[PDB]
Amino acid sequence: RNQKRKHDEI
Amino acid sequence: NQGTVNWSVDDIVKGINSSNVENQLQATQAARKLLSREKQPPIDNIIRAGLIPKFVSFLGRTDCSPIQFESAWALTNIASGTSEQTKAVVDGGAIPAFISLLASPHAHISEQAVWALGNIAGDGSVFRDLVIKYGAVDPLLALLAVPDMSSLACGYLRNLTWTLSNLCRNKNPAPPIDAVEQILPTLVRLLHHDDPEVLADTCWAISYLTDGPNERIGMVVKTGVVPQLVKLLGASELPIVTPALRAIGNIVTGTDEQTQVVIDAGALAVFPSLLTNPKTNIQKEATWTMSNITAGRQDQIQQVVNHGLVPFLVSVLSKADFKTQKEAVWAVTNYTSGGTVEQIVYLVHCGIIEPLMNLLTAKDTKIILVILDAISNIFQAAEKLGETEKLSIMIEECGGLDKIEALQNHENESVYKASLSLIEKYFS
Amino acid sequence: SELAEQPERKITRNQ
């Protein structure tokens, strides 16, 4: 199961 | 009795440094007028000259309201330029003086102080923490916390809201926690106002407070605001959609429990319109928001399915702009990585394969790998149903094999290995 | 709008 991506990530 | 419009900086300094009360005011207003034109406020000049701690002293003059007003404005406009400029204001000792001004019986003076504190805090985290440290929060909230805010002009309300927002704004470091706890209840309340600028300012504030560690997400969610955020997210006639969406997207980067507060408040029902919205930025942020939901538990992926959102993701993955397509990929990969076999079957039924494979010609390495991992995930579900051979032929007959073979003559070793593994395991 | 974007960090009172 994968990591959530924060807005910084986009 | 004079031409304050056409005074020089020299005239001002002599005026201020005079011991005569009227020339001091006159100078201070000449200052104000110069700083208030568009074409190059002589800001550096004024500092150079060593006036700031005089202006700061003027702020102290309860005896003379007009000189308080005129310096507040003057300082505000200084504080609205560069960090050095803003710093001069701070170095001068403006902050604690402005906070004293917040309780003036003259609203126009109080609100000028509010505006200045907004700019000081707007510089970044340091001056923001200084403004909080000197005690700005209680008096700012006192102006807004009310049985009578209704009696505040809208320009003032907007002004306060924007300043509060600046107090919530940057990171590295994020704002002190107990200041945030103190402020949040006002924000939650302002989220039920009707003025669109109040709403946007407070929504962006919530958005900032939700951008960080789970702990921060948690203090926001606990207020009970999230249903209200979802009502705003639905207001397609208003520009408030964007900040409400940012804040919701931030919330779903947290725990599964936090994500579940969003779902229970009923956010997913709004997404059909968010993913079809002509404003592409809203598409992207809704697809990003989706992707953190499909990264969540299986009962959460199931809610995404039950609300019919999967044909929408496919739609976006297929025919939207490349930035929004990236986010679509992330939603798919997370989905395939966490989903049940049934969930994966349904995704394939919705026509995920071809659009997903189209994006292997993307010139972005991070994204080729997650596409490959998603395909790899789909093949594992195919193993378990004994359909690997079927899935192989289909991928061969729609150009998918060409695009995977294409990747063996790629420069990145990882891309080369991942794609070779697929060819070996499923096309040998 | 113009209200859809983040507010300005610093604002000057002009004119």
UniProtKB/Swiss-Prot annotation, chain B:
Region: NLS binding site (minor), residue numbers: 246-334
Residues bearing PTM Phosphoserine: S421
Biological-process GO terms, alphabetical: DNA metabolic process; entry of viral genome into host nucleus through nuclear pore complex via importin; NLS-bearing protein import into nucleus; positive regulation of type I interferon production; positive regulation of viral life cycle; protein import into nucleus; regulation of DNA recombination
ARM repeat residue numbers: 2-42, 43-82, 83-124, 131-175, 177-213, 214-253, 256-295, 298-340, 341-387, 388-427
NLS binding site (major) as annotated region, ranges: 73-169
Tissue: Expressed ubiquitously.
GO cellular component, one term: NLS-dependent protein nuclear import complex
Post-translational modification: Ubiquitinated. Deubiquitinated by USP22; leading to stabilization and increased activity.
Ranges in coiled-coil conformation: none
Localization per Swiss-Prot or TrEMBL: Cytoplasm; Nucleus; Endoplasmic reticulum membrane; Golgi apparatus membrane
UniProt entry keywords in alphabetical sequence: Acetylation, Cytoplasm, Endoplasmic reticulum, Golgi apparatus, Host-virus interaction, Membrane, Nucleus, Phosphoprotein, Protein transport, Repeat, Transport, Ubl conjugation
Gene Ontology MF terms: histone deacetylase binding; nuclear import signal receptor activity; nuclear localization sequence binding; RNA binding
Subunit note: Heterodimer; with KPNB1. Interacts with ANP32E. Component of a complex containing CSE1L, RAN and KPNA2. Interacts directly with CSE1L. Interacts with PLAG1. Interacts with APEX1 (via N-terminus). Interacts with FRG1 (via N-terminus). Interacts with ARL4A, CTNNBL1 and NBN. Interacts with SNAI1 (via zinc fingers) and SNAI2 (via zinc fingers). Interacts with BAG6. Interacts with AIFM2; this interaction likely mediates the translocation of AIFM2 into the nucleus upon oxidative stress. Interacts with RSL1D1. (Microbial infection) Interacts with HIV-1 Vpr.
UniProt family annotation: Belongs to the importin alpha family.
Domains (record comment): Consists of an N-terminal hydrophilic region, a hydrophobic central region composed of 10 repeats, and a short hydrophilic C-terminus. The N-terminal hydrophilic region contains the importin beta binding domain (IBB domain), which is sufficient for binding importin beta and essential for nuclear protein import.
Protein's job: Functions in nuclear protein import as an adapter protein for nuclear receptor KPNB1. Binds specifically and directly to substrates containing either a simple or bipartite NLS motif. Docking of the importin/substrate complex to the nuclear pore complex (NPC) is mediated by KPNB1 through binding to nucleoporin FxFG repeats and the complex is subsequently translocated through the pore by an energy requiring, Ran-dependent mechanism.
Protein name: Importin subunit alpha-1
Parent-protein residues present: 70 to 497 of 529
UniProtKB/Swiss-Prot annotation, chain C:
Post-translational modification: Deacetylated by SIRT1.
Highest taxon above the source species: Eukaryota
Cellular localisation: Nucleus; Chromosome; Mitochondrion
Subunit composition and interactions: Component of a multisubunit histone acetyltransferase complex (MSL) at least composed of the MOF/KAT8, MSL1/hampin, MSL2L1 and MSL3L1. Component of the NSL complex at least composed of MOF/KAT8, KANSL1, KANSL2, KANSL3, MCRS1, PHF20, OGT1/OGT, WDR5 and HCFC1. Component of some MLL1/MLL complex, at least composed of the core components KMT2A/MLL1, ASH2L, HCFC1, WDR5 and RBBP5, as well as the facultative components BACC1, CHD8, E2F6, HSP70, INO80C, KANSL1, LAS1L, MAX, MCRS1, MGA, MOF/KAT8, PELP1, PHF20, PRP31, RING2, RUVB1/TIP49A, RUVB2/TIP49B, SENP3, TAF1, TAF4, TAF6, TAF7, TAF9 and TEX10.
Disease involvement: Li-Ghorbani-Weisz-Hubshman syndrome: An autosomal dominant disorder characterized by global developmental delay, mild to moderate intellectual disability, speech and language impairment, and variable facial dysmorphism. Some patients have seizures and autistic features. Brain imaging abnormalities are observed in some patients and include decreased white matter volume, enlarged ventricles, thin corpus callosum, and gray matter nodular heterotopia.
Family: Belongs to the MYST (SAS/MOZ) family.
Biological role stated in the UniProt entry: Histone acetyltransferase that catalyzes histone H4 acetylation at 'Lys-5'- and 'Lys-8' (H4K5ac and H4K8ac) or 'Lys-16' (H4K16ac), depending on the context. Catalytic component of the MSL histone acetyltransferase complex, a multiprotein complex that mediates the majority of histone H4 acetylation at 'Lys-16' (H4K16ac), an epigenetic mark that prevents chromatin compaction. H4K16ac constitutes the only acetylation mark intergenerationally transmitted and regulates key biological processes, such as oogenesis, embryonic stem cell pluripotency, hematopoiesis or glucose metabolism.
Protein name: Histone acetyltransferase KAT8
Shown stretch of the complete protein: 128 to 142 of 458
